[PDB]
Amino acid sequence: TLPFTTGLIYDSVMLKHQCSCGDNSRHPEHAGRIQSIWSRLQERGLRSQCECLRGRKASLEELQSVHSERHVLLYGTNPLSRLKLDNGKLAGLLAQVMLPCGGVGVDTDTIWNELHSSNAARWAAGSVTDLAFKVASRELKNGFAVVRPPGHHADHSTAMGFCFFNSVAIACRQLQQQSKASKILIVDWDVHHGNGTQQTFYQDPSVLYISLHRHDDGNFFPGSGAVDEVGAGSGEGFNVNVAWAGGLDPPMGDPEYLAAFRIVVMPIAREFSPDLVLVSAGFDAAEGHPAPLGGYHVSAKCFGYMTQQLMNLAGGAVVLALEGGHDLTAICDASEACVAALLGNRVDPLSEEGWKQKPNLNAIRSLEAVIRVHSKYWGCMQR
Ligand SMILES: [K+]
Ligand SMILES: [K+]
Ligand SMILES: [Zn+2]
Ligand SMILES: [Zn+2]
């Protein structure tokens, strides 16, 4: 197995995106998330095995492959950039929120550092784009992007949920620009629905979006991504919401996620036949996230195995990007597991006793609802 065919992307630029209130306690999407991951990768000796990359900033043009020109200028530029912008655009930015902690925000949760957040967000997006391009060109096998802030809630002209630019969707679009007619699968295993991703590709048959998320009948952030949302127009069939229903009791974890993979993710993915797989790799379905932040019990090994299964697709062209998840031990364990798998470590599904257990009935119900909906579009789902 060729060495240095797995990329890692990280850069200290992304640490500077911090509220001015200087308190990681009211702001779970904090710099410590990516630093702890980075060092863990070094400790367990995985970093040395990978072609490490720094990343770079996305260009405003790259940003605009997904986001409106107004969104890009708002979050992608700084007063006062060396930028050559016309006065009409300058005047627009003159036309244009306070947080409890006194820092500036886009909303309650989503903080804005006036010096550093634009560079950090652009850097997250360009880093995922760049890592991906390498995989597309066949110049790396797969890879893992250790990035913040996260991306998957940012829509065409909306920053929300800790996200400003949809790094994964931007990488998707860029890849497609650079290799005509390629087919891209985006798997989102972050516990939240990636509303911005679903909306970006909703009418687009060239991109298959599969999200697994806690849904509970519209009552978990962000409220989006019901099972009946399949895509529209040309893209009808190419949006798959594994919308988990029914809450936290009973316990949602490994047998549910493994079952979701066996039954829905893998069969639909193979039928689609993706040229490349991008993963919105949030770790907030990991054990270590209380009720309001998740409430699930997925294990690091399971994230590792899910990574491992996705490597059977697309010739192996697989790129994970960090999304949500903030319990440091949980996110570091999961990141480690995923990077071993990328390298070519194989998990022993027989190693784990709790993986002998049947998925819970809520999970079964939830998957039945997926099958029922998606039978219309996928053969593997027919009957
Ligand atoms: K998700
Ligand atoms: K699509
Ligand atoms: Zn603050
Ligand atoms: Zn999340």
Distance between CA 116 and CA 11 in Å, rounded?
13
Which residues fall within 8 angstroms of residue 217, CB to CB, at 6 or more apart? 245
Can you read off the two tokens belonging to residue 111? Answer: 């903080």
Can you read off the two tokens belonging to residue 192? Answer: 């939240």
Name the strands in the sheet holding 51-53, side by side, starting at the edge strand that comes first in the sequence: 51-53, 6-9, 142-145, 318-322, 276-281, 184-188, 207-214, 239-244
Cβ < 5 A residues, ion ligand 2: 201, 204, 207, 235, 238
Angle at 266 between CA 265 and CA 272, to 5 degrees: 90
Distance between CA 348 and CA 41 in Å, rounded?
21
Ligand nearest to the CA of 232: 2
Ligand nearest to the CA of 149: 4
Task: Spell out the SS3 assignment of the chain.
Answer: CCCCCEEEECCHHHHHCCCCCCCHHHCCCCCHHHHHHHHHHHHCCCHHHCEEECCCCCCHHHHCCCCCHHHHHHHHCCCCCCCCCCHHHHHHHHHCCECCCCCEECCCCCECCCCCHHHHHHHHHHHHHHHHHHHHCCCCCEEEECCCCCCCCCECCECECCECCCHHHHHHHHHHHHCCCCCEEEEECCCCCCHHHHHHHCCCCCEEEEEEEECCCCCCCCCCCCCCCCCCHHHCCCEEEEEECCCCCCCCEHHHHHHHHHHHHHHHHHHHCCCEEEEEECCCCECCCCHHHCCCEECHHHHHHHHHHHCCCHHHCEEEEECCCCCHHHHHHHHHHHHHHHHCCCCCHHHCHHHCCCCCHHHHHHHHHHHHHHCCCCHHHCC
Bridge partners of 105, per DSSP, are 111
Domains of the chain with bracketed CATH: 1-383 (3.40.800.20)
Resolution value, angstrom units: 2.1
Quick one: which of 119, 108, 109, 106 has its CA closest to 147?
Answer: 119
Q: How far is the CA of 38 from the centre of ligand 3 (A)?
A: 24
Ligand nearest to the CA of 153: 4
Q: How far is the CA of 210 from the centre of ligand 2 (A)?
A: 9
- Provide the 10 A C-beta neighbour count for residue 326: 22
Distance between CA 65 and CA 240 in Å, rounded?
23
- Provide the 10 A C-beta neighbour count for residue 200: 26
Distance between CA 53 and CA 56 in Å, rounded?
9
Can you read off the two tokens belonging to residue 320? Answer: 């994970």
Quick one: which of 262, 237, 263 has its CA closest to 381?
Answer: 263
Query: Of these residues, 71, 153, 193, 374, which one is catalytic?
Result: 153
Angle at 10 between CA 102 and CA 162, to 5 degrees: 35
Which residues fall within 8 angstroms of residue 76, CB to CB, at 6 or more apart? 58, 60, 63, 118, 121, 122, 165
User: Has 153 been annotated as catalytic?
Assistant: yes
Binding residues for Zn(2+): 19, 21, 27, 101
- Provide the 10 A C-beta neighbour count for residue 198: 23
Can you read off the two tokens belonging to residue 128? Answer: 């995922």
CA distances from 4 to 52, 144, 279 (A): 9, 13, 20
CA distances from 235 to 149, 201, 209 (A): 29, 8, 10
Does 310 sit behind a cis peptide bond, omega within 30 degrees of 0 on the bond before it? no
How was it solved? X-ray
CA distances from 282 to 40, 58, 71, 192 (A): 17, 21, 24, 9
Can you read off the two tokens belonging to residue 311? Answer: 């490597």
The answer to whether residues 276 and 311 touch, using CB atoms and an 8 Å cutoff, is no
